[PDB]
Amino acid sequence: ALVDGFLELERSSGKLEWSAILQKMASDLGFSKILFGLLPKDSQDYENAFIVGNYPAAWREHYDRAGYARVDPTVSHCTQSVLPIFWEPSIYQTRKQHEFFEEASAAGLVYGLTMPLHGARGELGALSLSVEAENRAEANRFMESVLPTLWMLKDYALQSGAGLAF
């Protein structure tokens, strides 16, 4: 089921089927929203990266124009770390972040995580999934159990997604 989705991921012909498979796999893993973003080596043109997924349309439009890529705690984490980042209220410290958080929360992006991507050819990116859980405890427990399967998703996605974005 998940193993089959991995294979379909690698078999994907174009951005459309691949991004479709990526969403279908997030939804099966109990995550209603997923975003994958990937820049070439040594680029910071966030708004013009390869970006796919099913994030809420209203929010994606806002995110690009407002340049939230430079605000988002997960984005600067990805460029400085390998470890995944859970969306704890604490990752949002500064004013523009306490404010990025309010709105992201209104868009449904409350609970979830971001996995940084560091490709073999030095590519940089982010794989985020959001889950609708009763509260933060349930969400963080849930995400710790499925984290191994997600890290393999991250791996099949980075590998197959680089030779389609680029």
């Binding site: 998940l2 193993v3 991995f6 893993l29 109990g30 889950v131 609708e132 859980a133 009763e134 349930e138 969400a139 427990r141 849930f142 710790e144 159990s145 499925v146 984290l147 191994p148 399967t149 393999m152």
Partner: protein, 94 residues
């Protein structure tokens, strides 16, 4: 039936357990394939090295243990288990 619990319920079979050690242990982990034996090989492998005296050859136990598993998917189940076991006893030690 919560949402997060309902995802656990399907995937019943693909779930695997790293039993409790000393620190707050019992990790319950979803794996893409059934892999409980690989998990236990990684747990035992790591205990065997701990239950050894003036200990000093950690990479070897890990390298030889992983190498005895034939699929990528088992190798990583073994790595996750073995390392979780080396965590359980790194925090049960201040």
């Amino acid at each position: 039936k919560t949402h997060v619990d309902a995802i656990i319920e399907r995937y019943k079979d693909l779930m695997v357990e790293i039993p409790p050690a000393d620190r707050q242990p019992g990790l319950s982990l979803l794996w893409p394939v059934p892999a409980q034996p690989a998990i236990d090989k990684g747990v035992r492998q790591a205990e065997n090295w701990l239950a050894d005296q003036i200990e000093g050859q950690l990479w070897t136990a890990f390298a030889f243990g992983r190498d005895s598993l034939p699929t990528p998917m088992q190798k990583t189940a073994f790595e996750v288990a073995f390392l979780t076991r080396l965590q359980q006893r790194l925090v049960a030690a201040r």
